Each structure stands twice: as structure tokens, then as C-alpha cells.
Amino acid sequence: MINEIKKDAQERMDKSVEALKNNLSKVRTGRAHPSLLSGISVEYYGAATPLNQVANVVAEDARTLAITVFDKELTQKVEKAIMMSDLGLNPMSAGTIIRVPLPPLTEERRKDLVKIVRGEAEGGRVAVRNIRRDANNDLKALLKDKEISEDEDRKAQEEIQKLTDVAVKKIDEVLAAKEKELMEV
């Protein structure tokens, strides 16, 4: 059962990492990231529809987003949706294209978002550490039931340790990159 425990821990940590990245993607920076608008929804033929199903979102340049609405009848609803997302964005349209510049961060706002991303990172780290703790306890149960040897338990913990260190390093790197962007003035 050691292998099942290791694989489980690995899948759980990998997903904790993805969860962190997803969360950070919702944090606006001075740089263009189509992902920032992933949560945008527009009323289409009576139903709340994802932005990506009614338009393509691309980075025109490092600091500008370009949104092309496929149906000309949706351009203004899309634009309004963006203004409603309260991201401090000023979308401007023409035809089916909505240009959305990414404005620079004010000092006060930069320090606030840094706090937020560093806090999210810490959450990812505690998540991964909870998984290591949960996996190591599962190994202990086996050891104590005499299902695995002490040496197998110790080797397993070592592996768990490595999965932990990698996940945490991944989290630290993702944080660094995000802070680097936030520090851009």
C-alpha cells in the first residue's frame, strides 16, 4: 500500500500547486494575462455564458488585452461585464474588438496585493504540509499493523519528504514570479 500512499500524496500536492496558481491568476498585475478574465460571464440567450465561449482573449502586448467578440450583438454586454468585474479596468470597443489596457499599480495597491499573494502561497504550503502529515500517518498505521517494515516506512517517508520539498519549491517559484510582476512599476 506504500505505493498507493505515495501516488496519492503526489496527486494531492500537484493539485494544491495548481490551486495556488489558479488563485493567483485572479490577481491583476501591470501585465496582460488573458487568464485574469477567466471568471467573466455574459448573459447569452438567457443563460450565463463563460467569456471564452463568446470571444477570444489575447495579449495584444505585454500590457494590453484584446477581446474579440464573435457575435457583434454581444460586444457591449461583454464590455459591461468587464466594467462590472470591478477590476479597475477601462475597456474600449470598436466593432467586435474590446481593448483593455492593464494600468500600472499604485503603491498602496501593490503592497496590498503582495500581502495577498504571499498569504495565498503560505496557504499552499500548509496544504502540502498537511498532505505530508496525512501520508506519513498512513504509513505509520501500516507499520504499527506490522504490514510494512521499519525500513520500508523510513524509505517511504524519505520519498514523501522529497514530494513535499518539490511541491514547496514549486510554490516558492510561483510566488517569486508573481511578486516580481507585482513589483514592476
Side-chain angles (χ1 to χ4, degrees), residues 72-87:
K72 290 206 170 188
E73 307 164 63
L74 282 182
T75 310
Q76 302 192 314
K77 300 212 286 187
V78 178
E79 180 175 347
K80 182 175 184 178
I82 297 177
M83 302 183 269
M84 304 291 246
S85 63
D86 192 19
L87 263 338

Side-chain angles (χ1 to χ4, degrees), residues 84-121:
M84 304 291 246
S85 63
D86 192 19
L87 263 338
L89 304 177
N90 192 231
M92 297 163 273
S93 72
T96 58
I97 303 179
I98 306 174
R99 285 230 325 168
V100 178
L102 273 295
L105 299 176
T106 64
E107 258 306 288
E108 55 267 8
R109 187 59 181 167
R110 189 204 316 292
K111 95 155 189 169
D112 281 6
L113 296 183
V114 164
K115 287 190 174 183
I116 300 298
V117 308
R118 299 181 76 148
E120 235 67 46

Side-chain angles (χ1 to χ4, degrees), residues 13-183:
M13 300 189 176
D14 280 342
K15 55 213 305 164
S16 285
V17 174
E18 292 308 299
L20 170 60
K21 296 194 297 192
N22 179 260
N23 281 182
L24 298 187
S25 76
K26 292 273 49 284
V27 170
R28 178 166 58 79
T29 71
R31 292 225 176 196
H33 289 292
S35 66
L36 177 66
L37 309 185
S38 279
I40 301 292
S41 291
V42 180
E43 173 92 287
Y44 186 69
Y45 278 88
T49 308
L51 210 204
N52 81 326
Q53 288 187 25
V54 297
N56 285 317
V57 184
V58 304
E60 182 174 286
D61 59 32
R63 70 198 82 68
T64 313
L65 245 44
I67 310 162
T68 303
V69 182
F70 306 128
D71 184 351
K72 290 206 170 188
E73 307 164 63
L74 282 182
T75 310
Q76 302 192 314
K77 300 212 286 187
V78 178
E79 180 175 347
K80 182 175 184 178
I82 297 177
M83 302 183 269
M84 304 291 246
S85 63
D86 192 19
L87 263 338
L89 304 177
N90 192 231
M92 297 163 273
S93 72
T96 58
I97 303 179
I98 306 174
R99 285 230 325 168
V100 178
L102 273 295
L105 299 176
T106 64
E107 258 306 288
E108 55 267 8
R109 187 59 181 167
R110 189 204 316 292
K111 95 155 189 169
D112 281 6
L113 296 183
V114 164
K115 287 190 174 183
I116 300 298
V117 308
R118 299 181 76 148
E120 235 67 46
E122 186 46 35
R125 285 194 285 269
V126 305
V128 299
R129 283 192 262 258
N130 281 320
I131 298 173
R132 177 192 84 108
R133 178 173 289 104
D134 190 36
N136 280 163
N137 185 226
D138 285 347
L139 288 173
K140 181 189 181 304
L142 296 182
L143 173 61
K144 261 53 196 308
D145 286 328
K146 286 298 182 179
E147 279 164 335
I148 60 179
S149 67
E150 210 174 11
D151 53 73
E152 282 170 335
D153 175 65
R154 293 185 168 197
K155 284 293 296 179
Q157 304 171 336
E158 166 88 74
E159 308 289 16
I160 300 294
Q161 162 198 55
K162 291 177 180 176
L163 290 173
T164 302
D165 294 351
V166 169
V168 175
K169 181 182 178 182
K170 247 44 61 185
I171 290 175
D172 292 345
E173 279 185 41
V174 160
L175 204 212
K178 187 67 173 187
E179 290 209 33
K180 186 180 69 181
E181 214 168 77
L182 288 174
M183 293 313 277

